[model samples]
Target chain A: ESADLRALAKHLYDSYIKSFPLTKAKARAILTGDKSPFVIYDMNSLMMGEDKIKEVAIRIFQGCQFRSVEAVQEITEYAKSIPGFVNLDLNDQVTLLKYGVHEIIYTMLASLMNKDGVLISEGQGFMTREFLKSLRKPFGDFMEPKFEFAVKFNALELDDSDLAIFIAVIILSGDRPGLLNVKPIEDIQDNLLQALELQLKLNHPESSQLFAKLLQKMTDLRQIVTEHVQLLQVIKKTHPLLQEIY
Target chain B: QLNPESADLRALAKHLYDSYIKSFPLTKAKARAILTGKTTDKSPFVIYDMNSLMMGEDKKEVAIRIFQGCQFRSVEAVQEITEYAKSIPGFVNLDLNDQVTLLKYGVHEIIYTMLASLMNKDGVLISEGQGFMTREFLKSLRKPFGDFMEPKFEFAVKFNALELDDSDLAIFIAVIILSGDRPGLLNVKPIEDIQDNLLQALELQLKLNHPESSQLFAKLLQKMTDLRQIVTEHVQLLQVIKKTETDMSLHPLLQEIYKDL
Candidate 1:
């Protein structure tokens, strides 16, 4: 089981990493004394008709959010293989993910997050959270807590291995409202967390409180999604996958 | 022996060839002006501007700008290059990251491939071949790039010698862009599988398209190797160039590829 979790950990990590832009080449470009890794796309300064800029921003955020949501498939592809996952009742399977992937999606959003803002369109553009917040109500409202959680979550300095299990932990919850088979999920979750706890100890031995801290972070993410759904009620946009997931 | 997949692949290759030539045709081929008679002093050759048809003499500053001007057009070609890549039959089936990885590494090579159409030993025919920029003029920008244009012209001249018909050139270009060996492609197998598909068709296309030419297949493969070396030397030279010439920059995407490739 330990060996199994380690392999699963790496697979989930790659899936999560693959979901976003590959920054290795992009980052190294700057190390060779190339310019900024970011393609600084500030529409506020570009030559443009006035009417288009605000709406352009709206679409930019819209497209950015859509791509972010699309990442769920990339990261959770390993979920289908988790021991208890496929064994679950079909209704229970859908139930867990409906409540679960949202947390994993925002949790993984930490990778693209930083002190400034997240990237969009694989270096097509970047927007600071300040800039993101100045946009429409639901757009900003929905995004605020995401980065709010992302900023703190990143401080744990977790590598992909730790994160890999964390997401598996996030998704395998038996607490999902319509879940019918809780016993297997609890056992699977228990096996996963034992491996996850070991991963944190091995990765971050200096900080003894890390596991407790991460557990709290998990609860914070739950509340973040709780608020996220509240604000999402007012937003006038579409995410076919996201609409189903929520 | 062509299966439906091979037939489909060949059609795609054919589409690329036609698409490339359609975007650039003989209209870009040059014609001399009536007694314009422009030159410095007893010069054997004259290079004219595409628009004005006036002799384009070598000025160090203008030479850099002119090469960059051609480069800017090359950057514009990247949009259609991407469109073409997306339209390639098996390309989109690769992992999205792999798709992006191939494009990042391969565009510079493919851009040079496109240049073969507009280039000859004298200089690349610029501004849609309406104007010509001589090799001498580009060689004059020796400070920053330092003989950068020389190898490319030589390679261009040699690559053009293969006399690939549209079909052959298209397959070659497709092979260049879909390279599975490009660094950072995590999902290499699928890309390699597609490259295999192209290679099988490409070798046959060589035999089918050029019955008169011996070792044309071998020669084309060497050109691919040479092209890869040229890309390597390009990045290596620029790393040295960057120590002093910090102000002048490549296109964002171009610089990014040079760093990784």
Candidate 2:
């Protein structure tokens, strides 16, 4: 049942999460009283000017997007390790990379988010509630629900294996509307789901329902992606650069 | 002859599994054998009278009794469906390891889907409609397993609201079990083909059965998604239970299925 692949997933996630230690350290420093060097204002003190606030918000989002793209690149590399994924015709692979990357990216975001909210740029900074509210209209509203879902999702306290399998499931989705070679893509998704379920079974034996619960989170992730896409569309209008990275 | 592309195949599969369950109730010994992976010459499929075993003093004891009874049925149902899935065309064609992998991951999803069938608006029918438990009563059981039934119950109530027949239920269960989306499936083409065919047939049946509602098919799919979420919550509850309630032992298979082994 591709046990090796499961381990591969775990390894990828561990390394991916580990790569952000500096960012995490910076975030921790901000929490403890040392301010993030990237931005002049800390979470506690919001700089006054409306334009300055928008500038900071966009900069933070850009930093977060950089990390997200980096994470997505790592995930894409891992997808190549999947049996059918790299074997997929290059067009389809590119199509998946184009459309499906955000879902994977957001799932990572959901995982990174705590009850407070997601840390930005490897945790070089955090996405504070007040700052998010201060962002321009749609952008502020856009991230609000994400944190809401993420915090609740974080309450589940998933370990690395749980997250690893989950990321696999997100990456392998074949249900994307315009996917070419639907059969192969669907097949990959199925194998990943089965692996995730089995992994969940073995990993969280005390929590029999964990497999089902994780499966459910995929649906929640699906919902979040819908909003993410909407937000992406809005951002695309103003900042084509964000669209490029995502 | 059943048409794999038509709803008849789905109905036949459901009928096959349904008859298997009706014929073989989970005996204490059979439950032990199945969980322990031992062979039993004694009839494993014998039916039991679910109503006759309501022997407990208080509601708590009564709830526990009902819980125990349902657990046995759940175990038997999983076993029955595992066998039944094997009987499906193309299912056996997949790698044997893949088959077991699917069974391991798919058991609970199928269980909850089947549980939806046993439910009425009031609550789950414990044994062939002979015994009934109220939804409120089931929700009152202590945590870990107590809230486990509620999400399924809530889902079952809404799902049952769809008024799908056994044929639709069978097809839907097939889609759930043969999910091409589960992780670690070595080869997904055959499984996905089977699921896609089942989904197409099921959609046709829904359109045929409920022509008035344009959104029925989408709603049905949404419910399946919701069912997955409920099961996630149930697993979390089980995790909490395992960590906190050290004395409360879980079934061995369940332990492998639910907890980190």
Candidate 3:
């Protein structure tokens, strides 16, 4: 899995690099002394046209996003192959892992003291809190936070697939830990400490929208991973996440 | 083919032949006068003696202006111009052999300069007028361009499969081919129309001088009748081969590229 992620990372880098028009000629000129290559490219002409920057960025990110999505999908397939692995097929495992690892370990428990199951159930939606409790102690904070730090810092100059792995690791670990005593409202009011740190971090040249995107991805993954679980529930009778979950 | 001792003479003859083909009609007009009746006393055809400054200056500008505008395409528009040349009172008839001589060595100075100018305007021209060259002359002309010149020759070659002595037939055919692609005032609405137009240009040029060239025209027509018999058979064979070669080369490529479309 690690080797595969690195391969995907290299491919992502190549895709992004090629998506830049000037990069190819600049690279060639480094090898050949011919002025023809330099003649064709100008900094102003490096544009692919009006929507150039976003178009290049999107394609580069999409390549990375696809790799992450494929990894999540493949993990689901692997879990289905476990001999008696319970009804929790890989998709459920990944979702449970991602939300717990990101929102709980990194952001939730890192900021909240709500008892594990207290505010979770809201009638039809209540089951989610129960599931989190089951996986809480065994693969809880101890297993995920180290991965969070790894996810947070792996590659600054890396491409999308590498970034995707960084994202998947963070999401799968649940959320970060927080103080147990503060009221939810006060925590929200004084969240500026972390926000200030975030601003300071952003001022560093390495902290770009790409990193912000990876952070925002935790929210997006919350939706995507949650959707896959909902899908598993509806199809469980005929197509469960795992047979044991039935 | 001539005596070894006469090699220089042969070279001179060949040079004259080439010059005749490239020489201008104006030069032919002068040559026509010189070879026929009027002596040097009749007046220089278009120029005074090079020694006379005033006449030289006038002659120089007039000759330049006339030749500049009297290009082949212009001749088609000014049909009377060639006729007017013939009407010059001092002119006399040259024999069929002499006309061929003029075409071989003298026509180039006029025709090639004008053709080169036209080519400068547009690279693509209907080369049909080149048919005015005899195949022998064409074969001779091909010396510089070498083997690759064959396709061009094959293009301008105007002979039937019969005996190849038909020089006039060959030359006339060369003219038609050269004019075919070269844009001219001669309208070519159809293949038959091209033939008729070319024949008209020829007959008109001869009639411009009237009875002086009547005997020559009759002789020319007689030669043409015989050459056509040979060309008709020969062209049929070559045209079929050429058409098939063209089709085979284009068939598969066209189908492959156009299939999805």
Candidate 4:
């Protein structure tokens, strides 16, 4: 029988991994399951030698899913058409995928508004109209609320948990601006839990709960983020990046 | 309202406070008595008492008071306070750690607090790189504070990617890195921003005892960013090639790489 490689390729590419429950299940089986903070970063620390590669890897592993990243990448390739993306080497391409995507999310989150959906800028006065124009297609029509929230929350180093917290808080509260009111508490709690579970998966369960509980008390995204930042500073001092931990 | 205008007043006050505190063994009670003026001659040095205000007060209040006082004390004072920190039982849950970790972090807190106190004194402020306060006195105040101030100031300043080494940046960046953002191979800008400040700090550290980190730090900084890019790109390219050529079944690790990159 002659082989129909194209159809098989289409079937395999389109179908095999998309809906398989066993894939993540099998992958989970092979992971060290060690739950030790040291093991995850050892190779990365060794190769990078105090560089934060392993740190990034562990974080990416912690918060990311296979599909959301693909979606992010697909959306970001449009950056190529923009004049700023022309000179990217392979490394730059990776950087764009990792870092630039955050910039986009930052832009989108900065745009979301209250129930009225009227865009409102954070008044940083840095982002230009051109930047807003760039953001229009990616974020629905308004670029103001996401802008306001990002500035208000200082979203530059925002992690997946932070991202989820912002989204859950924003969406749950129906996109209200400047310290979301208490109306969306339950839905915020639900999606915040979802985000926490994603981070907790096998390890970091405690940290996840801590984050969720912390988020629960927050009236505005900025308040929790401020506290979160202070807590992390204390942790980083003794535990230098890329060092092995017991 | 009795002012310690002379040593006579100081002695009488100390004597009175000591006699009054004899009834209460805990130093906190003595300090409170002194602070409230109920006891006389309480040793002013008794400010070294660890649990002085934390006992009757809430943790936030304690944190604020300590944040004002011991956070910017002299190195000897800071060291003593850290040593004193290990003596407490409830220290663990009070703020955020077990006893041992709390002690370890206490000394760091001293340095961070001190830096925050000193650098912020001249009113230099920035929020995530959006606000810039250009004061020449700013850098001078930081000179005595040392590199410990730089990291903390990074958080206080909260610099954006555009301005990395701004002395006014917030130490919160430390938290962002720890609990918020993960280091990834991307661009020179973000890492370079951190390195720019870290390098300046290293120069100061080299003038003291950190010659080792100073020697290898630059190379390490450049290489890590390089390796981060390499890992992400390697995983991404391999995944892309596999999807193009073979069945979609690649290693799960590669899939993880795709997500991160």
Candidate 5:
């Protein structure tokens, strides 16, 4: 733990375990057995009556948004709590959260990722990719991609500990637009990656390429997040706390 | 036209094109249309540098607020350029310090090059073209503050005459930012190497895309040189303004990049 990379991983492991919304067990409970009061409709249909879905999508969007955020601080604090993140200029902090927040939230989606679909409403409801894809272009296109990304990412079987380190790496990305000082952030990411590679080695050494494979998924998450934001802006859906980050 | 290197250059343009499209926000024609959105989008008068001979503090103040209005957009412009540079394949592979060095020095140049798109004979557009600062009314803020921008207006006017498309400019910008000649560079060899590939890519692109202008390649080299000179002049003018203005100071990002000490 004395090594900066190791220390940071443990720190993020704590970050992930502490801040994570729900586990598969609890999610499984809500998901099975009289999960009444909650519904598992397609996200495709959520778009049918814009008002009903606005609150719904916004919930998961910002619930994870809120969950990660507090109503706004979970991720914000998560990001701020990361070593050296606070030293970043004020705007770079906002820029990172703005560009990287969705990617982090989607990464967290692994918490509810099921084989056929992702759990919805904090696992109170469930929706399938088949169901998710059944909707209109603007809607289906956006949610389906999220489900796919999570399914593959879930297959990686990274635990809450590794997930924390991964999200930490996402936040420190030098690739985000408008960063003021990249060297320190890039330098920080260098340590985090070392930490991450070792975490993968320790956690899933048998797979041999899980670290490489996981990094690619992180890259894929970026592309998916980009199109998601594009469609979000294109359709102009508003959920509370949605605008606050994007 | 079976040349492999030419074909290679052909492929190279796509990545830079992807970088440009993904990160940059405006195009000349597209940005020009954003002008039509202003409440009047119609200003009372027009034409380059035709100012205060008749226009007043009234129009000048009108333009000044619009000038100041774009502080966020302007900051975002630098933001996007940083992203666009990172977007370029292999751009981030360079030394971390060098990445900042390249961006720190080259962002201003990149902005000026792209400024041509938003500019026309009479004026340039800002704030996604929603805010128009007519050249006639663009005065009253410089005499150095105003004085410095004149060099740019001249630069933009001529550069626009070339009518380079987005793809050409995208590679051209990569070449600008990757200049091995920038003073603080650590790994000149890799940067110089990328610059050559980029420069050649740009050179072939001009001949292919602007076939009518036989000398387009040479002319673009000239524009690159012109961008360097304009930036040198900008730093000097900026030095004085930062010193002379008692109450004024530069933004932290701006101050850090422009600072000599």
Candidate 6:
């Protein structure tokens, strides 16, 4: 049973990653400079002046924007392709994407965080732990909680298939506000959960509560996205230019 | 002023009001009076000196008591919200299984939100306003349990600062309850429509109530998102406790909820 589920999860993960080129691992490698293992830059060097802070902010905003847009497009398309997802009314489809995209974005972002709570961006470069801590009010506060969540999520070490299936479950969520055909959406989520549970069972046989823990991760993912939106609201208030990007 | 369709909405609003006001009835004014020993007439047990416990065993005992008290209070809050939802007009119209599923996934998120109302910049009131643990105290506890509450406190402090009144809170909690997105729900349309109306009501209420601050409505909605994150982190803490501490006593309801996650 475990072996069968394992193969099924791998196929799902690989197919998704292959369709979207520039995997998170590749992006991390490019951002970190593969050979240069240690981070030479510090918070002081990163944010030396107002201009530097804006530069870093702009780069990160752009980088995150690009990543999120890509994720939203790909995941939305993939969701439409799902058997029951497309069956949902168009309004519900839009609502799910509207509410669920941020969750998917951060889940993808979680893949970019290491166990030590550092986030990487393909174009914006490494978001060092100290740099995030030194950030001003809403700016610094915004990214820190996300890194905290990402680090914990990364600790689960879910393979690509598990992550793919998890995202599907998230996108097909019936709980998003204003969903009309929630029953069908829920049916899709249940199928994904069954698959995910089986995969976790096979993938982490020795870890007794791994499946439950992963389901809990979905709750956490929802929470993280909620905070992410809050931070975005704050960011829009303080930094109007960043508003357009989101 | 209520219509036939809105009779249940009105009841829900009242239930939301009662849920918070009745379950853990403590105001900031009263909490201050109790904590500062300003009110000599009130019960003595309500005003325990947090700093007075110096002995090792005493500290451990107090910690356990505080921890357990916090859990019990939170569970009670969840129970209240569940009862409140059950009384909502069309909520029970959803499948019985869906009702359970909605409560199962939605309870913790709402509990965390309600817990924010019980918090100050200092920390959440564990036993009403009677037991006020400082943010520093909760974070310093021994592992498994240590720092488990710090995230919730962090969120609560920020959320409390929003200064949402009871009416505002009622609508917000209603939205959380009537959410159509829980995975196993059997009726999404009705719940979603109810949520939409609640949100509209919340918007108008915020507009009329906080006419001065235009961003208040948007900011309040964003806080729900923040609450979600805090609950997620809090869930992680529960996971750690469930995995490592053999002697830790988690409530059965909490165990069932946390077991799946």
Candidate 6 deviant stretches above 4 angstroms: A1-246, B1-24, B27-63
Q: List iRMS for all predictions.
A: 14.8, 20.9, 44.6, 22.4, 14.1, 18.8
Among these predictions, the greatest lDDT belongs to 5
Candidate 4 displacement at residue A205 in angstroms: 44
Model 2 spans with C-alpha error above 4 angstroms = A1-246, B1-66, B143-145, B259-261
Model 3 Cα lDDT, one tens digit per residue, B164-192: 22122223333333232322223323433
Superposition TM-score, candidate 5 onto the true structure:
0.50
Best by DockQ: 5
Span of ten consecutive residues with least summed lDDT in model 6 chain B: B51-60
Task: Give one digit per residue, the lDDT tens place, for model 6 in B1-261.
Answer: 657766645544544554444333554445545645686674223222455333322314656676687688766766667655643445644555566667777788887776666566655554445445566666666665667777777787777677677767777777787778777677788788878877766776677667887788789888778766876787877777667766769887776666565
lDDT of 3 at B239: 43
TM-score for predicted model 4 compared with the true structure:
0.18
Native-to-model Cα distance after best TM-score fit, residue A57 in candidate 3, in Å? 33
Q: Candidate 3 at A25: error in angstroms?
A: 20
Instruction: Please provide TM-scores, in order, for all candidate models, with all chains considered together.
Output: 0.47, 0.42, 0.15, 0.18, 0.50, 0.45
**Better structure of 1 and 3 per DockQ:** 1
Error of 6 at A28 (Å): 73
Q: Model 1 residue A102 lDDT?
A: 78
- Per-residue lDDT tens digits for candidate 1, residues A60-106, read 65455545445544443446556567667656765776688778777
> TM-score: which is higher, 4 or 6?
6
Better of 3 and 5 by lDDT: 5
Cα error of candidate 2 at position A138, Å: 74
In candidate 6, the residue pairs with backbone N, CA or C atoms under 3 Å apart (3 or more residues apart, or in different chains) clash, namely A174-B180, A174-B181, A175-B180, A175-B181, A175-B182, A176-B181, A212-B261, A223-B228, A223-B229, A226-B225
How does model 3 fare in lDDT?
Answer: 0.30
Better model by TM-score: candidate 1 vs candidate 4: 1
Docking model 4 quality class: incorrect
Q: Candidate 3, what DockQ? A: 0.00
